Structure 1
């Protein structure tokens, strides 16, 4: 096969992507060992769905798991009557999701389960795949001539040839695994044929963070979770929290081998100690550095020039309401809260008006990082930790370190009931989720 493994792509045909996927336990070879995972389409990751604005998607999900499941069309601004976080597909049953891809949309999105209390074990076991919305912007020479790859960043732990079970500690911290994989492969080699790479990045991990840095190179950020930036932004490193996506250009500077690494990062995970009296909780400290892939540059690389511009960000109407959402933790109970409450699917927490803009102030009063995700309604991050964001782009997950406040500009789009929650998925399963109704 190609030296760099990527999920198989399924493309829309004549404006229609019609596909049947089964969620099924699947024996496969992964990282040199045999394991049974839970997969879509018999693969890990699931197939990449590649569509264009205005395409029709018709996806029938058959549930061959022993428990209920569903899909969340993560990042897509579509109706929560389709992207329905309350829908349960029982074992053996099927459900067809049908929607039209919005006209003003581009980027890397993804699909995975969202059923309260069951997300963490299902996602950890392999139920995830990417969804790419192609853009006319993709035809500009500076992108068209780049070598494009998808990197699905997802870790795993195996026990007895199956995904390792969640421990009590995993429910508190979010589960991380020792196998730190890219597209299900262990430290693959990417032998570049072109000097400019266009990498679409997806953190599909339950809880692991990826503090991305390419040896000897900067990265040029060109898209966030849900759309292009206005122009490329040069960065020395790029943190991807669980659920986040990004697209970068890499301009290879000389021949040789360069490591793409996940550098040490302390997200506030905790261990337990006993040193005289307490059987007390203690910081795990930063993650160990990981090599994600080996990038081999071609001979005499001469990168394309960067595009001068990408996509102008919409000028939003003035906001009509400000919200405050405070995140807190009870670590020893593995319970997590928004404004002092745990999720209740019967309880509406916020009621907003379609087509108005709201300001959401999300404050992390816990001691761990908490990435905050809102379904259905992409947002513009204005600032985090009191620092203004250095670009304008659509996001749907925003990371908050302990004590930080994020201020978000949230246009409400589709009407209906949807959810917002922590995307360390164990924390969502353990209560850190609320309900928004848009009318």
Structure 2
């Protein structure tokens, strides 16, 4: 297949306190030119899977209309929300039904967020078939960065939703996760574009990289001929870092989002820069290297902006006297466990969904150190709902640039221990039921998921 121009998703300015219908439905998309692929899409204002824009402090009034053919619910991945507005599997609605999310205030920092379905056992299916979209929150820090660099969505502020998928001869998607290894696609897509290219100018570009794959992690570099080009991590799932972090590669797992700045003024006109995936070395399942995307520096520019010294304030969590919660990732006869338990171990069908089984319980305002201990042969990108966290320590090596800042998904390599810090402070007048689960969608679907509770 010839190189294809990178698709840039549409955008939707989500109004403040005004109800918006988000409809999941079956349709046909032309991913490969000349072929119709049956896929699911979120429809918002006659746009398919648009980039949703939010302003920090606004009211978020969403109704999920489910025409997907099965139970479903939208999860606002990374949001601090009341849990009945968060998209918990208990609240999934049947086909033809609507879930009205109670109003809540956007209180998260500016950055790149993620909306996708969260139904029990079918999240891998629905995400893979097309229910996935990016959210961009804006605050005053994003305003100053946008001015410093003259950023503009679709111009030099570019989403890169990276996904791997497999197509049959007729252009239909093939979803055959092998056992408990997660799904691994044969074809790499960016914003549902196979083998993509994008023309760039000699300017600074911001790329919001979102791993929307079911299981595949990426180790991404920018190759300019022989050498690896430099670039800067500026943000993670929970928003901007304190300062830019210069790197020459980033590791991004499913559920992670990495915001980077790339200064194509490093390159000459007519250069081609390959966004390349190297072996991820996190021990169907594939560890190969391959090009993700090609950038063509086609035009010169008078761009004279500088990468700023400071991006935002990331306040470190005070961990003195914090409670420790050890979360051991095991496997029980080809079934991955969390502290010896799966979702099917009392969590799946609560007698009272307002007071279900929880793995552990905390009081509002508790600082907790969570200690993931991976005793399995596979990596797990572990995600908690309700709060962002700060990565304290990895037993296998130093923190990586992508480990900094406010995170909500941390890579836990085979036989690795990772310590994170969570300030579980929420402004709600009711107790909260939040998920803790692996973000390899098949793992999550086959039960690597529990509740935890934070009281009022």
TM-based fold match above 0.5: yes
Mapped partners of 1:222, 1:172: distance in 2? 34
What secondary structure sits across from 2:68 in the alignment? coil
> How many residues were matched structurally?
419
Residue 413 to residue 17, structure 1, CA distance change in 2 (3 Å): farther
Partner of 2:174: 164
Q: TM-score, length-normalised on structure 2?
A: 0.86
Alignment of 1:105-254 (within 5 A): 105-140=109-144, 141-145=147-151, 147-159=156-168, 161-167=171-177, 169=178, 171-193=179-201, 195-216=203-224, 217-252=229-264, 253-254=266-267
CA contact 1:334–1:430 (8 Å) conserved in 2:
no
**Which deviates further from its counterpart, 74-83 or 260-269?**
260-269
Q: CA separation in 2, counterparts of 1:215 and 1:18?
A: 45
Shift of 1:226: 1.1
- Report SS of the residue matched to 1:81: helix
Shift of 1:99: 3.6
Q: CA distance change for structure 1 residues 105 and 93 in 2, over 3 Å: closer, same or farther?
A: same
- 2:292 counterpart of 1:291: yes
Q: Partners of 2:412 and 2:61 in 1: how far apart?
A: 35
Residue 401 of structure 1: how far off its partner (Å):
0.8
- Find the aligned partners of 1:134 and 1:220 in 2 and give their Cα distance: 20
Task: Give the whole-Å Cα distance in 1 for the aligned partners of 2:19 and 2:296.
Answer: 35
Q: Which segments of 5 or more consecutive residues in structure 1 lack a partner in the other structure? A: 271-283
| Closer/same/farther in 2, CA of residues 210 and 376 from structure 1, 3 Å limit | same
Coordinate RMSD, CA, aligned: 2.3
The 3 A distance-change label for structure 1 pair 261 and 16 is farther
Cα distance change of structure 1 residues 269 and 56 upon mapping to structure 2, 3 Å threshold: same
Q: 1:394 aligns with which of 380, 389, 406?
A: 406
Aligned to 1:276: none
Deviation at 1:296?
2.5
Asked whether the equivalents of residues 6 and 191 of structure 2 are also in contact (C-alpha less than 8 Å), the reply is: no
- What is the Cα deviation at residue 5 of structure 1? 1.6
Matched, 1:263 2:278: yes
TM-score (norm 1): 0.89
SS at match of 1:20: strand
Quick check: 1:354 aligned with 2:384? no
Kindly state the Cα deviation for residue 178 of structure 1 after the two structures are TM-superposed: 1.4
- Alpha-carbon distance between aligned partners in 1 of 2:191 and 2:68, rounded to the nearest angstrom: 23
User: Taking structure 1 as reference, are residues 406 and 428 closer, same or farther at Cα in structure 2, changes over 3 Å only?
Assistant: same
In 2, Cα distance between equivalents of 1:57 and 1:126: 23
Q: Give 1:24 deviation, angstroms.
A: 1.0
Residues 390 and 336 (structure 1), Cα distance of their counterparts in 2 relative to 1, 3 Å cut: closer
2:98 corresponds, among 83, 94, 100, to 94
Match of 1:61 among 61, 64, 68: 64
Give CA deviations for 1:92-132 in whole Å, capped at 9, x if unaligned.
11112244343451110011111221111111111110111
Post-superposition offset of 1:313: 1.1
- Distance, in Å, in 2 between the alignment partners of 1:420 and 1:178 is 29
Q: Gaps (5+ residues) in structure 2? A: 351-356
The 10-residue stretch of structure 1 (17-26 or 392-401) with the greater mean CA deviation from structure 2: 17-26
The aligned residue for residue 71 of structure 1 is 74
Counterpart for residue 390 of structure 2: 380
Residues 98, 143 of structure 1: alpha-carbon distance in 2 compared, 3 angstrom cutoff: farther
Deviation at 1:161, TM superposition (A): 4.3
Query: Quick one: structure 1 residues 58 and 292, their matched pair in 2 at CA, closer, same or farther if it must change by over 3 Å?
Result: same
Q: Counterparts of 2:304 and 2:276 in 1: how far apart (Å)?
A: 22
Give 1:10 deviation, angstroms.
0.2
Among candidates 439, 446, 451, match of residue 423 of structure 1: 439
Asked whether the equivalents of residues 338 and 432 of structure 1 are also in contact (C-alpha less than 8 Å), the reply is: yes
Q: Distance in 2 between matches of 1:300 and 1:144?
A: 13
Partner of 1:27: 28
